[PDB]
Ligand binder design. Sequence first.
Ligand SMILES: *[C@@H]1O[C@H](CO)[C@@H](O[C@@H]2O[C@H](CO)[C@@H](O)[C@H](O)[C@H]2NC(C)=O)[C@H](O)[C@H]1NC(C)=O
Ligand SMILES: *[C@@H]1O[C@H](CO)[C@@H](O[C@@H]2O[C@H](CO)[C@@H](O)[C@H](O)[C@H]2NC(C)=O)[C@H](O)[C@H]1NC(C)=O
Lengths: 49, 17, 23
Amino acid sequence: THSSPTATAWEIGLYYELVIPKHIYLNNWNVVNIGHLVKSAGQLTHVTI
Amino acid sequence: QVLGPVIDWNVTQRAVY
Amino acid sequence: SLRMQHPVPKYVEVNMTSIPQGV
Ligand SMILES: *[C@@H]1O[C@H](CO)[C@@H](O[C@@H]2O[C@H](CO)[C@@H](O)[C@H](O)[C@H]2NC(C)=O)[C@H](O)[C@H]1NC(C)=O
Ligand SMILES: *[C@@H]1O[C@H](CO)[C@@H](O[C@@H]2O[C@H](CO)[C@@H](O)[C@H](O)[C@H]2NC(C)=O)[C@H](O)[C@H]1NC(C)=O
């Protein structure tokens, strides 16, 4: 906004985005599906939920 | 149309000695 | 002379547990 050899001035525009939480969850586990093998009419088959 | 197998993830049930 | 190898018994303990629904 101003530029002398002994003086300066600047302006900065900052925009902020604050997420407001509804609930916070701390003690958490990841799921790992393993399933089960089934041997049916000769064929081996992997079964999963 | 026959009834098929049942699975219940019980290890103790499938023990072989 | 006659060298031989006689088998002698031993064992290792192995515990196993289940995983309900396979999860
Ligand atoms: C898992 O399998 C075992 C073995 O089939 C079950 O344990 C038996 O339960 C019966 C009663 O329902 C007892 O009479 C037997 O003595 C038990 N056997 C042994 C080796 O412990 C067990 O109930 C099954 N189900 C679960 C959920 O564990
Ligand atoms: C692992 O478990 C086995 C069970 O088979 C232990 O075997 C026993 O070892 C002792 C010697 O300390 C023998 O006197 C017993 O007869 C064995 N028990 C059996 C065959 O039922 C073995 O010692 C264990 N190993 C370790 C490293 O702890």
